[PDB]
């Protein structure tokens, strides 16, 4: 199958540089055009620039002229996207994508997207604290002070899915700070178990917190 | 640098109707024009190539028209599955370059916030701090105002408010309301009061913890 | 003497089609390789092909397959070049050159280059204006204002004064083009002697000589 | 296809010295590079081909070096009518392709704009419309600010400017300022001046007409 793999997130202080990598499966890696997109947080679609790896023809975006550079690893079928000299304007998602047409259907794949932030400041782990209180009972989930983003929440492993809401991350006090809420049948919580699965993978964390009644 | 401007920013329809939305180009483009969606925290996907033709696994429920400069993105049978920001592309010129994105919206009738507290947790109080955590889930119209009451007393610092999109199932809206004391704090106070003011109710929803 | 004879501009609607001519004269017209280059207006050069007339073999570019279309009139000693569904994209110059290696020296020979604008609007010729002043040494000038499409040669006293001479680029404003030209001069010159400027727009068959009347 | 970067997007430099241009290859391509001069408004120059052999007529002062991937253009005894754009090119594989192309820029002590001011001509009038022209010629460095004012307010709307590249001769700047109003409009009013503001200026550069 294909697959365009990308880390979550990178932390780099202003000034500093920092390197995306792209890691491509499951198709013939010098075949495709190997694309590029920027998107600020709330912001629009911005075109860096794409890579062909069969020889590393390039076309660039003007705006990211001398800031982005594409290069492509072919031992490995990685692609590559260094940033240099970071300002906080550069603190965005970065996307790589393909486009395949196969004589038949025309499909596009997209790698998860890195979050590279620009900032001074360290990481820090999120606190994941339980949020425990008729037909339907609701449970919830702190995830409290963590930097930088982002972070990931399920509920069960991703069993427990209908019924969650999952609020976006406000900075706060140089912090982010997230919450979720799951609705379940009474018959469920306190009886079976609901567990909280928090993933930060900007400091390697990944907790299981779960919804005891107490 | 070719320009695509898109006239709305938000399009409005009912479950089941029918959306459009335009995007105007500074130049020719011909027919080398791209549709994309994007629900909130995922990567983009492709709807349209050539304008008008469609990537593998999109419904024909999306149909792209438009030659030149106009080019128009028509969604039939509207879901709140659909509920997304749509974006215009160019792949005529180089700089490839993008719209300003048009975020759907669907209309539904009004619904009240279901309300939930949580006192901060025995974890948490460890750590010197205490959060209290009110969530008001699955109300329309987006519009909602919380307030925070210690005692009576109206809080409006130390509070952190998140509202999510549009919910892709009731298309509701929800939001996460978090006032953080210290401990010290927390437990110099007894009564800790959640007040929403909704459009639902001329009298606000109430849900309050007495720590005594 | 070995010449390239191109068209000074074309002026050519959205979507239809334009055959940009080079002339070559003096010279074995089968004998060398036929080149052609487009320059976008501030960008740089790229290659679109070559066709060799003596049996019109091509070397096409990829980017160019479907859009230019190399051809050679052999009973006239011009060679053409075909752009269909013409683009904003395909507003540019477009050079014919050829070179020369004839056993001692190797020589260039480029055409003057065809500007073709793919737009809308009409043509329009332009009005030239006259700056005379109300010391050693006076600035007299020239208002070359409301013509298109590009481009207008400007000179003066039929190119016998060039040195002094500052002629500015054109800017767009509402579909037309506006450039000024000024040239300074002893006292001993102006008035006493006539100074002219001679404005070419050769999209209109336009050819005005304005003198600078005090 | 093969990509020739040119790293530098300007070279600066004085008269008399000598510069150097880089241009890397992604490929291996031997010595089929040629490197061009395009001049403002001209057709591009051949300069150098087979990486180091100059095209007849090119002076000895243009040189080329580099085999393989990394190549060189030396331009010694550098003139202010070496001003251009330098573009190399490779021709080992197909399709050919050309370097994104370096200025010449050339330092300079700086100097003071001459300033000039004409009112509307009388030809112009009688097509309803009026343009006030300002000349700003040979002044260094490029920056340079231009206010239009109407009987002493400062106007904004229907101005356009425009700056020529480096003289050819003195390697200075120049730029012309025209506002355009109607006919009417321009006879609305009486005082008309474009001030000038540079690095030179201890005090703004005023020329003015009174209608
Ligand atoms: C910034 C993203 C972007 O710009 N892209 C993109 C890249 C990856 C994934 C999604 C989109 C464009 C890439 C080029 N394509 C050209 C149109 N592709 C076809 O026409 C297929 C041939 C059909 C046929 O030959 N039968 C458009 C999208
Ligand atoms: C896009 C332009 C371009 O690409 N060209 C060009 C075309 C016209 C004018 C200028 C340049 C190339 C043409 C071919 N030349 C080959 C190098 N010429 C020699 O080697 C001489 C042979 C001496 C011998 O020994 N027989 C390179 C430039």
């Known amino acids: 199958q294909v697959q365009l793999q990308q880390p979550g997130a990178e932390l780099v202080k202003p000034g500093a540089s920092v390197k995306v990598s792209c890691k491509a499966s499951?198709?013939?890696?010098?075949?495709?055009?190997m694309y590029w997109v920027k998107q600020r947080p709330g912001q629009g679609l911005e075109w860096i620039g794409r890579i062909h790896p069969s020889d590393s023809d390039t076309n660039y975006n003007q705006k990211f002229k001398g800031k982005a550079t594409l290069t492509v690893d072919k031992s490995s079928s990685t692609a590559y996207m260094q940033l240099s000299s970071l300002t906080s304007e550069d603190s965005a998602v970065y996307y790589c994508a393909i486009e395949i047409y196969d004589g038949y259907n025309t499909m596009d794949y997209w790698g998860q997207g890195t979050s590279v932030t620009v900032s001074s400041a360290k990481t820090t782990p999120p606190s994941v604290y339980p949020l425990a209180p008729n037909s339907m009972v609701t449970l919830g989930c702190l995830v409290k002070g963590y930097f930088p983003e982002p972070v990931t929440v399920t509920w069960n492993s991703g069993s427990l899915s209908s019924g969650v809401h999952t609020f976006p991350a406000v900075l706060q006090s140089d912090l982010y700070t997230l919450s979720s809420s799951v609705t379940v049948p009474s018959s469920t919580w306190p009886s079976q178990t609901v567990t909280c699965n928090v993933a930060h993978p900007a400091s390697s964390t990944k907790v299981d917190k779960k919804i005891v009644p107490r | 640098d070719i320009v695509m401007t898109q006239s709305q920013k938000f399009m409005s329809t009912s479950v089941g109707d029918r959306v459009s939305v335009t995007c105007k180009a500074s130049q020719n483009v011909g027919t080398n024009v791209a549709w994309y969606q994007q629900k909130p925290g995922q990567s983009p996907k492709a709807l349209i190539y050539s304008a008008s033709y469609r990537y593998s696994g999109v419904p024909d429920r999306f149909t792209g028209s438009g030659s030149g400069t106009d080019f128009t993105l028509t969604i039939s049978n509207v879901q709140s599955e659909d509920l997304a920001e749509y974006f215009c592309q160019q792949y005529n010129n180089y700089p490839l370059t993008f719209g300003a994105g048009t975020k759907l919206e669907l209309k539904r009738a009004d619904a009240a916030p279901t309300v939930s507290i949580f006192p901060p947790s025995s974890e948490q109080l460890t750590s010197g701090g205490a959060s209290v955590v009110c969530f008001l889930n699955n109300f329309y119209p987006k519009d909602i105002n919380v307030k925070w009451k210690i005692d009576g007393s109206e809080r409006q610092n130390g509070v952190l408010n998140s509202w999510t999109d549009q919910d892709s199932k009731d298309s509701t809206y929800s939001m996460s309301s978090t006032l953080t004391l210290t401990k010290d704090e927390y437990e110099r106070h007894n009564s800790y009061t959640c007040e929403a003011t909704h459009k639902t109710s001329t009298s606000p929803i109430v849900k309050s913890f007495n720590r005594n | 003497q070995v010449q390239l004879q191109q068209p000074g501009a074309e002026l050519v609607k959205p979507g239809a089609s334009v055959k940009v001519s080079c002339?070559?004269?003096?010279?074995?017209?089968?004998?060398?390789?036929?080149?052609?280059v487009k320059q976008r207006p501030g960008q740089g050069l790229e290659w679109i092909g070559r066709i060799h007339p003596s049996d019109s073999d091509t070397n096409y570019n990829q980017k160019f397959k479907g859009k230019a279309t190399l051809t050679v009139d052999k009973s006239s000693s011009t060679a053409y070049m075909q752009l269909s569904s013409l683009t904003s994209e395909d507003s540019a110059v477009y050079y014919c050159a050829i070179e020369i290696y004839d056993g001692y020296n190797t020589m260039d020979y480029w055409g003057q280059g065809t500007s073709v604008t793919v737009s809308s609007a009409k043509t329009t010729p332009p009005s030239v204006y006259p700056l005379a002043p109300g010391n050693s040494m006076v600035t007299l000038g020239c208002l070359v204002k409301g013509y298109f499409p590009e481009p207008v040669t400007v000179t003066w006293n039929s190119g016998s004064l060039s040195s002094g001479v500052h002629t500015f680029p054109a800017v767009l404003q509402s579909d037309l083009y506006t450039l000024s030209s000024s040239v300074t001069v002893p006292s001993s010159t102006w008035p006493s002697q006539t100074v002219t400027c001679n404005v070419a727009h050769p999209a209109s068959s336009t050819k005005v000589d304005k003198k600078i009347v005090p | 296809d093969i990509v020739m970067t040119q790293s530098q997007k300007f070279m600066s430099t004085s008269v008399g010295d000598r510069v150097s241009v880089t241009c890397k290859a992604s490929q291996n391509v031997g010595t089929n590079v040629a490197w061009y001069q395009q001049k403002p408004g001209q057709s591009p120059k051949a300069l150098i081909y087979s990486a180091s052999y100059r095209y007849s007529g090119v002076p000895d002062r243009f040189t080329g070096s580099g085999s393989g991937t990394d190549f060189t253009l030396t331009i010694s005894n550098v003139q202010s009518e070496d001003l251009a754009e330098y573009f190399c090119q490779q021709y080992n594989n197909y399709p050919l392709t050309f370097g994104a192309g370096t200025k010449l820029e050339l330092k300079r002590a700086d100097a003071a704009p001459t300033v000039s001011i004409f009112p509307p001509s009388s030809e112009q009038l009688t097509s309803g419309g009026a343009s006030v022209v300002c000349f700003l010629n040979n002044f260094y460095p490029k920056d340079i600010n231009v206010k239009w004012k109407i009987d002493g307010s400062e106007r904004q709307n229907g101005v356009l400017n425009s700056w020529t590249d480096q003289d050819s001769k003195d390697s200075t700047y120049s730029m012309s300022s025209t506002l355009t109003l109607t006919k009417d409009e321009y006879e609305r009013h009486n005082s008309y001046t474009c001030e000038a503001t540079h690095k030179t200026s201890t005090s703004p550069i005023v020329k003015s007409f009174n209608r």
């Open positions: 499951g198709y013939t890696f010098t075949n495709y055009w």
